[PDB]
Amino acid sequence: MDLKVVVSLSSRLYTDEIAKMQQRIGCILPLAQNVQGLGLGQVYSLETVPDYVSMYNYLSDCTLAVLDEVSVDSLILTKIVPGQTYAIKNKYQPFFQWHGTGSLSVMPPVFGREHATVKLESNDVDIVFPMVLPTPIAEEVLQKILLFNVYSRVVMQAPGNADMLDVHMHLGSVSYLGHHYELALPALLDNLSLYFCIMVTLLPRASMRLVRGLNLFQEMVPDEIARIDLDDLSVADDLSRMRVMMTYLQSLASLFNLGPRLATAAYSQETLTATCWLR
Amino acid sequence: MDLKVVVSLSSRLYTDEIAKMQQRIGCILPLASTHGTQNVQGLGLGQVYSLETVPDYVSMYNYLSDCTLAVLDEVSVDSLILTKIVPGQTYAIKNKYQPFFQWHGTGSLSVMPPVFGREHATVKLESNDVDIVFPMVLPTPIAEEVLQKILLFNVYSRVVHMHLGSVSYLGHHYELALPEVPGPLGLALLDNLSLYFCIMVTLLPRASMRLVRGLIRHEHHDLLNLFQEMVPDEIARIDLDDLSVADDLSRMRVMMTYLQSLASLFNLGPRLATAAYSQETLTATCWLR
Amino acid sequence: RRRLQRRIAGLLPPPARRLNISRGSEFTRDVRGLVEEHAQASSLSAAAVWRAGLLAPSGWRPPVFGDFLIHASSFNNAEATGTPLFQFKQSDPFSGVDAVFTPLSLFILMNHGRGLTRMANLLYDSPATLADLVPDFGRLVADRRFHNFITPVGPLVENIKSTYLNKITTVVHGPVVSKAIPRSTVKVTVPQEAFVDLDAWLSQPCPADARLYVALTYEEAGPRFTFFQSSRGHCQIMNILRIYYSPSIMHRYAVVQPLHIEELTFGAVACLGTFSATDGWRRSAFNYRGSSLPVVEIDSFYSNVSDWEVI
Amino acid sequence: GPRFTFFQSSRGHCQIMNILRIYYSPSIMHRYAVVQPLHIEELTFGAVACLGTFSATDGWRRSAFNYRGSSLPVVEIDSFYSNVSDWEVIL
């Protein structure tokens, strides 16, 4: 079949734009054809706050596409389907090695906007690429950025319980299969940390309503501090609490799944290219 | 690959049934088998959704995620033709559904059992005494709220509740059918959620309570409106301790894998990726994600 | 050369049909050729199955293969073809050698420290090089992180023999076919003593493809590998194994201490592929020079390995 | 308990009795040390019997015996000539 999608470039590029595109040819790019909303760069603009949850929901909504050639007037890219495979490359300025890892995540880049972008000065837009990275690295950087947000908020409010340097000691670097990567951490990512925060502080009353739904067997295993609570609450506020509880828990749980999870078979470290099929 | 099953009827279709089927062409229908010729007795969701028993939609979720999926193209006299859905093939699906949920977001849709009432999708054949029910097709943000309302009426049967019963959509509000007792597998799913909550109530961090305390007292977000300026004493009595980093990171690793377990537990029913949804034709070129 | 021309004439896709809308009389012979092609690509004769071989290049796909380099000492060349291999995650940057595990070698990795035992210790008598082959086994099943360092790469299809530096070629994703240019079909051989059919344990919708699941678990005796076969989905089979793991939740109730997060986690499951649900599994017997064990034989496998989803 | 140990030898009966006394002289002291001969009949220690001859050159070429699942080492004596004899006590 035909799958070669052309993006309608109205403006002809200069030579440094060709250099900045040929640096990152093997990576993937999302989609909505038009050229303004062609990538994830519309979230990382100055138009909206760099929020995480709407970025991830757009990224799970929007299809992806890998590009093979770049010309000066036409952006040639092939879109992703679950049918066949494509060859993708890890050409991100935050570098990560695919040494035999069969799983790949497409998370929004929380390594900063400048670390994952291509800035088009002559063109109207400033495009970015989403982070393609192995899934244990992905969940690890999710943990170490989420707790960095929480532990940074707790020291903005009162640093008498946590310390910025001590949480930066353990949360400054991930380590997986020997490759010791660094986390450039300086607001961003406040919606997700607030979601997780209100969700884990709302789970005790949810678990107690669940254990009073249907006895001492499953009531023994909660700890004695998380067991004692006063059972005096009206039906309206508690109904709203449980509704928004399972709402944001569904958002959180589908968030901790990393979108359309790419899979690779043989990664050539010589060519930085692996066969990649949608999974 | 001519994937074209012919579901032959046992008896002759009447004219009002012909108009009722031909009004609903291109809608999602589940098959029992994938073999070259099936029968109406065994077609559709009517074998698991009967008028006899309680509507248990969780076993229907599991039947839908198990069984193959199809869309209807031809209804003639004495026969109707179905087209199977395989991964790797793009199909045209028209929004001909009586609970009008517009797919203007063009996100991932979800096949759902007709929780919104049998009577709008109980499409009737009096040729053979069979009641084909069409499963409802709706987007994912309405799918998560109908699934949480299904899981919440079972826990709020004991202890206003019209907000719990009816769905909250931006365009319209449709009333769905709620059974009082969910059934065997809905109670099994809520029991699995109960054991998950009773186990992971102690696998929660302690700096988030300091976060919600400092943010309710210091900088009230829009997202902190649910407490209405109220904190229990449980938050303080798990804030009586000092905060650490290693056991919190390990608790967070097992937390991410348990919330992945929660995600794939709540992910019920097949999910189809849309591509270039046409509002004017009311159809959407989709493949099975 | 003439044999090569007469063979390359056979392996040749047909030319596409033409419509000459511009001329008038050519449209007659165009639609005449169209009905001539249709009537002998539809009617019951040998001309019907003749058109099934041209394949029209969504129907057929060439599969990918996994080329890996191991030592010949960790491998037994006397095995049958469709052996589900388990690659281990290597921590070194430029290693080149990867720890693959046939289920017999996986069985002697399992039991050493704690018939399948007889066949496994008859093909893989030495436990020193293979327990040495992993960096650590007891702590890695103690921290319950052994699952993420085990990745499946599907069944073997062609093993080139070697005195040392053995190379295995396995189908990781897609339809399992042999690699030789004379064609053969690889039967996936899985030993019965770690296999079960889940419908024999359950005791009704006819599916398209019945999947094959592997569920490594952390049992109190040690590691246990189970090759599950089911009729259902991934999000379905995790619920089915939630019903099956009835003593596992009792063991999880048994550990009073919550801060030790090892014993709250009980293994992970992985979807290896999708075979023919109609042409079901057969029981076969892979023989060695000492014994012969019952081996579950699956034909027509379409492999797509899933991640380790934690129970 | 008893054992049925076999012996191949190219020597006479008169030599095989004495050389088996010499070979089993650790076991005579062993049996005297682990049990004490309170009664008369336990003073005896084993007996032999000549079973037959074969050519000493190409005898006892080793082989293997395979059952359904196992294999034990077996010995194999060619061109035998069975001559049984009576039980000469060894002590």
UniProtKB/Swiss-Prot annotation, chain A:
Q: Which InterPro entries match?
A: Herpes_capsid_2 (IPR002690)
Q: GO CC terms for this protein?
A: host cell nucleus; viral capsid
Q: What molecular function terms (GO) are annotated for this protein? A: structural molecule activity
Q: Which domain of life is it from?
A: Viruses
Where in or outside the cell is it found?
A: Virion; Host nucleus
Q: Which UniProt keywords apply?
A: Capsid protein, Host nucleus, Virion
A Pfam match: Herpes_V23
Protein function: Structural component of the T=16 icosahedral capsid. The capsid is composed of pentamers and hexamers of major capsid protein/MCP, which are linked together by heterotrimers called triplexes. These triplexes are formed by a single molecule of triplex protein 1/TRX1 and two copies of triplex protein 2/TRX2. Additionally, TRX1 is required for efficient transport of TRX2 to the nucleus, which is the site of capsid assembly.
User: How is the subunit organization of this protein annotated in UniProt?
Assistant: Interacts with TRX1 and major capisd protein/MCP.
Family (UniProt)? Belongs to the herpesviridae TRX2 protein family.
Full protein name: Triplex capsid protein 2
Organism (species): Epstein-Barr virus (strain B95-8)
- By which gene is this protein encoded? TRX2
From Swiss-Prot, chain C:
The main location class comes to virion
Domain of life where this protein originates: Viruses
Give the UniProt keywords, A-Z.
Capsid protein, Host nucleus, Virion
One Gene Ontology BP term is: viral capsid assembly
Q: Which GO molecular function annotations are given, in alphabetical order?
A: DNA binding
Q: Which InterPro entries match?
A: Herpes_1
A single GO cellular-component term from the record reads: viral capsid
Pfam families in the cross-refs? Herpes_VP19C (PF03327)
Q: Where in the cell is it found?
A: Virion; Host nucleus
Instruction: Answer whether the UniProt record assigns the keyword Heme to this protein.
Output: no
What does the record note on quaternary structure?
A: Interacts with TRX2, MCP and capsid vertex component 2/CVC2.
What protein family does this chain belong to? Belongs to the herpesviridae TRX1 protein family.
**Summary of the function given for this chain in its UniProt record:** Structural component of the T=16 icosahedral capsid. The capsid is composed of pentamers and hexamers of major capsid protein/MCP, which are linked together by heterotrimers called triplexes. These triplexes are formed by a single molecule of triplex protein 1/TRX1 and two copies of triplex protein 2/TRX2. Additionally, TRX1 is required for efficient transport of TRX2 to the nucleus, which is the site of capsid assembly.
Protein name listed in UniProt: Triplex capsid protein 1
Organism of origin is Epstein-Barr virus (strain B95-8)
The primary gene name is: TRX1
